[PDB]
Design a protein around this ligand. Structure first.
Ligand code: HEM
Ligand SMILES: CC(C)=CCC[C@@H](C)[C@H]1CC[C@H]2[C@@H]3CC=C4C[C@@H](O)CC[C@]4(C)[C@H]3CC[C@]12C
Length: 458
């Protein structure tokens, strides 16, 4: 086998690479940087930028060997800003920040009430309710606008649908974000959530302790945002104990399997993990459905057929939409919520004939895989057919893979399906202009400029 010190890449000028990363852009084009590296060093490259070093792969086969050596307690990179807040406020770590035995001990409890098929069917009526209210809002706006159209940037509205839905199944209450005049308690909560995501982007590389040392507003606004999010969790917890004398939070407080401190930590991290993720995916999807109207009709045809063969039963209808679940994989292929999965190797492995010493951070380039003509034929075309009647697990890594995969993947899928089912039944999504839209990096994959979509009743 080839030694580690022979892997291609730029690990020999890490300090010059740190200069090239911050001199211009860089923190906005990490997804484009990876593609170039793979198109320059091959199916595997080793990179070092400052004190950061890692081995990267693109072939789904290599992701196999990677996930087989992650260990019993897989460890990804950490969210420095989010961890810094828990240390400052002496809060417990949730299922996302924990590692080792504590994560495993938690994950298993959380899985019974978040990802198990038993509770997924209990979430269907809840998610569908929010999905029905979103369609009502779109009709109202279309009525006002006249001519039966509504050209709008659904960015903010989709963010509200994501937050409204996740908080419905987690806390067991409707925040009312989809109204025309939401109550100030929810308007301040969504603003705090938004400010929280907006303040993490800067501290993903800039050490949080450094911004705290200079009393930067970035650090202060971050703490102020998490405070509101944690206080809204206490507000719920208190109401639930008052009602003792339903939601994920209520069931965890009933079973009394985890401490309230560990329950409050996880319930919060669960919300953060699926508010910006589901919202942007639902946006990229609506965008590609408008650039590819043939796919939108093909889906609409299948959903209308499933509506009648199911006889109202959403459970049956959700099992009868294979092309819809394939469209979700297709969106996550061109626009992955995370440009890479990270796993700290716990055993010496070999990838592409190269010894990878234990402890090494190996990343799986999801954005580069989904756009490689080799792994995916016709990559730049949105064709959900490529996923049906095909097999492929290591090609659809959008929600990760393994014991520490996305614990809310079923909640996300269900929510995104119910959304598309209700939206395609009532409206046709038309692109205001066939002009190209560019992708940038900031926490996730977001469009450079707003996406303007027209919604006509059908
Ligand atoms: C389109 C929607 C979503 C996408 C694409 C997505 C994607 C991902 C990915 C790639 C991971 C890491 C997987 C890995 O490292 O192997 C992850 C982890 C996680 N996701 Fe999501 N996610 C979505 C929605 C949600 C939702 C709705 C929730 C609700 C709780 C959620 C909660 C979490 C949590 C808590 C983790 C970390 C769990 C752990 O590390 O043990 N996500 N997600
Ligand atoms: C909730 C979810 C998305 C799961 C895991 C949580 C957490 C481990 C991940 C999610 C996104 C990561 C960044 C993503 C991309 C990059 C660019 C990479 O080329 C360099 C690293 C970097 C910035 C990652 C940093 C840590 C984050 C936030």
């Amino acid at each position: 086998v080839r030694p580690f010190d022979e892997i291609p890449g730029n690990w020999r000028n890490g300090w010059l690479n740190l200069y090239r990363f911050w001199r211009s852009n860089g923190f906005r084009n990490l997804h484009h940087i990876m593609v170039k590296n793979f198109n320059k060093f091959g199916p595997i490259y080793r990179e070092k930028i400052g004190y950061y070093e890692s081995v990267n792969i693109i072939n789904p086969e290599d992701a196999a060997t990677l996930f087989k050596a992650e260990g019993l307690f897989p460890r990804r990179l950490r969210v420095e800003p989010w961890v810094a807040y828990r240390d400052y406020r002496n809060q417990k770590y949730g299922v996302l920040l924990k590692n080792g035995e504590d994560w495993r001990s938690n994950r298993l409890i959380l899985n019974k009430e978040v990802i198990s098929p038993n509770v997924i069917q209990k979430f269907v009526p809840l998610l569908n309710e929010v999905a029905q209210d979103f369609v009502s809002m779109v009709h109202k706006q279309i009525e006002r606008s006249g001519r039966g159209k509504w050209t709008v940037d659904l960015s903010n509205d989709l963010f509200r649908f994501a937050l409204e839905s996740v908080c419905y199944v987690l806390y067991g209450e409707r925040l009312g974000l989809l109204q025309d005049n939401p109550n100030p308690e929810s308007q301040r909560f969504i603003d705090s959530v938004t400010l929280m995501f907006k303040t993490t982007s800067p501290m993903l590389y800039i050490p949080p302790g450094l911004l705290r040392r200079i009393n930067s507003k970035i650090w202060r606004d971050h703490v102020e945002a998490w405070d509101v999010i944690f206080n809204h969790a206490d507000k719920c917890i208190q109401k639930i104990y008052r009602q003792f004398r339903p939601g994920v939070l209520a069931n965890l407080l009933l079973q009394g399997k985890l401490p309230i401190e560990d329950i409050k930590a996880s319930i919060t991290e669960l919300m953060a993990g699926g508010v910006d993720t589901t919202s942007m995916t639902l946006l990229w999807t609506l965008y590609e459905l408008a650039r590819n109207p043939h796919v939108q009709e093909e889906l609409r045809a299948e959903i209308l057929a499933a509506r009648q063969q199911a006889q109202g039963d959403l459970s049956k209808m959700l099992k009868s939409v294979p092309l819809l679940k394939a469209a979700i994989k297709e969106t996550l292929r061109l626009y992955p919520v995370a440009v890479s999965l990270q796993r700290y190797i716990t055993e010496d492995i070999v990838l592409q004939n190269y010894h990878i010493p234990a402890g090494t951070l190996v990343q799986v380039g999801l954005y580069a895989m989904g756009r490689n003509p080799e792994i995916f034929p016709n990559p730049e075309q949105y064709n959900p057919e490529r996923w049906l009647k095909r097999e492929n697990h290591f090609k659809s890594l959008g929600f990760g893979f393994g014991p520490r995969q996305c614990i809310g993947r079923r909640i996300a899928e269900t929510e995104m399906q119910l959304f598309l089912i209700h939206m395609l039944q009532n409206f046709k999504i038309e692109t205001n202009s066939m002009a190209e839209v560019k992708t940038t990096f900031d926490l996730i994959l977001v469009p450079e400029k707003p996406i303007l979509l027209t919604l006509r009743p059908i």
